Structure 1
Amino acid sequence: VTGLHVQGGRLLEGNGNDFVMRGVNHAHTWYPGQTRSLADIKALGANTVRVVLSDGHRWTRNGPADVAAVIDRCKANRLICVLEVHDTTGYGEEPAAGTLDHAADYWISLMDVLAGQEDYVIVNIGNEPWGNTDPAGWTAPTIAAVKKLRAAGLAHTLMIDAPNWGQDWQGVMRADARSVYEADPTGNLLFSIHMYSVFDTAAEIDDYLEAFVDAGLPLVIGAFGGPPDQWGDPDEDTMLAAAERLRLGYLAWSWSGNTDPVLDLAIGFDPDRLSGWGQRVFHGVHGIGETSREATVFGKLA
């Protein structure tokens, strides 16, 4: 038995040890020059980074050599690597958005560089791959993309984002999760909820996470916020506490470089200059410094 995989609703390393993501998102595709971000993120205690890629539909395609380099750099910094295609974001509502099938073709094109990296790399098929229009339409192409990647021979653990821009507020991923999970013959599939202003009360967070846990289905919070936006105030204190209580993975949005800097954890990619949001995530109660454990595949650091 090798590779990251799912068993009993838990993400396990090849050696069977439970792995709970404690990390952040890094916007690699828009910031190719910010090479030190991965080392900086590791130094602040993260055990996982979610790396923003483009499949070229909307932004500039990250080619195989670039992706190979990203994977190697994650391994060099003793980080588990969640790769994700951002171009799918908001499909049906964002005009520029790409399809999950287009993302799937891109992943298949990367299989030579993904090969042998199942201990380190999780494939998040497409970011937030449906908007708020007809979110029930998300299920069929998500299932099709899962089946297509498995048919192509991809063995990595998969990660699945929800419609309603990843916040699933109409409950489609929650309702249809069992059918999506069953589309993966290997069972190595994670669901990912994104929590922004929909998740502005503790009960919304607890009930959502517990719905997956109580169903036996694996869930991570693959992107989440904290500072208020135009739709409300995300309750990040409950996100962090509930994720620790249930020992579910989380990945804060984002290291640095947002067009609106309100969600930058670090200001200007400087790890010593954390925003209030960055301080909360890295140094606060139930945060990364407190609760992140390195993946055991890397061994005991000298």
Structure 2
Amino acid sequence: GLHVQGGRLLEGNGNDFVMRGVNHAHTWYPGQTRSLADIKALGANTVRVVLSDGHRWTRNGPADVAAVIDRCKANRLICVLEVHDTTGYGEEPAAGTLDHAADYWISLMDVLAGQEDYVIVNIGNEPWGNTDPAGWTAPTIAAVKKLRAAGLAHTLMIDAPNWGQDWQGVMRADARSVYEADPTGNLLFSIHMYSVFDTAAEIDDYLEAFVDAGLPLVIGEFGGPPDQWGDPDEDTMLAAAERLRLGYLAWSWSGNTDPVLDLAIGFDPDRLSGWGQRVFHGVHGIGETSREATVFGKLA
């Protein structure tokens, strides 16, 4: 299956796989089924699919998840599944725990079975807010061990505290210990880069900290247009991800409450925002740099 070796994400056949894709808000948009096909048509090789474990939003049951996985495969996309309900724990009142998310993943094991070539399990989205981010490490390690003890073989993906941006550096500091908690070694870290990452050196230094330590890292979400906290330097994110050959997944296909981060307007793939054009068609973008996973074979 998908696995980690020498700090790289590899397919079962040993070929290096570098994610070039986007996030799609499946759990809030069950009617936008065409999104995956559209995302593939624009060149993506991976989609990160927003699920809910039912803690905060409406649980995506096993049949629905099986269908999402099948749809990813039908569109020759690698599938990163993630539980969104953990977002901002300790600061967002409605947030769920990583243990709750873990019980959800365990409940999905029957539909995840046999899909290790295609599906990566991102335990919980941004699973800690800005309050006491050092508290993130213990439950993260516990969730990893719990899923492995349950028999889950899929490559795991781990999000950071401080709402995924890790600005207190807790994930960066504690990564080795988190990595070692997975007996299989098949674990990826994921940084979300928004307005914290507003200078080239912030981005380069963060990514390089993981690369130089031999730990695998992807940019599981990133933004581009400015917000009230600053202006993410997406140009450097894309260039650095290409230089270091690290995966990236843009946020997001469509349907944000604030549409500034919609890559496509109204789920229409022909109508990309400035942001969508940058990500899909710009330098170091998806059209330029995305290679299909080799597990799918050569098309036609």
TM-score (norm 1): 0.99
Query: CA offsets per residue over residues 107-138 of structure 1, 9 Å max, x none?
Result: 00000000000000000000000000000000
Query: CA offsets per residue over residues 39-89 of structure 1, 9 Å max, x none?
Result: 000000000000000000000000000000000000000000000000000
1:159 Cα offset (Å): 0.0
* Aligned twin of 2:236: 238
Match of 1:19, SS? coil
- Could you tell me how far apart the structure 2 residues matched to 1:57 and 1:231 are? 29
Match of 2:15, SS? coil
Match of 2:277, SS? helix
* Aligned twin of 1:213: 211
Match of 1:141, SS? helix
Query: CA offsets per residue over residues 160-191 of structure 1, 9 Å max, x none?
Result: 00000000000000000000000000000000
TM-score (norm 2): 1.00
Gaps in structure 2 of 5+ consecutive residues? none
- Could you tell me how far apart the structure 2 residues matched to 1:230 and 1:126 are? 26
- Could you tell me how far apart the structure 1 residues matched to 2:98 and 2:5 are? 26
- Could you tell me how far apart the structure 1 residues matched to 2:227 and 2:93 are? 22
- Could you tell me how far apart the structure 2 residues matched to 1:72 and 1:211 are? 36
Query: CA offsets per residue over residues 218-268 of structure 1, 9 Å max, x none?
Result: 000000000001100000000000000000000000000000000000000
- Could you tell me how far apart the structure 2 residues matched to 1:204 and 1:228 are? 16
1:36 Cα offset (Å): 0.1
1:294 Cα offset (Å): 0.1
Match of 1:55, SS? coil
Count of paired positions: 300
1:8 Cα offset (Å): 0.1
Runs of 4+ in structure 1 deviating by more than 4 angstroms, as ranges, are none
1:149 Cα offset (Å): 0.1
- Could you tell me how far apart the structure 2 residues matched to 1:297 and 1:114 are? 17
* Aligned twin of 2:141: 143
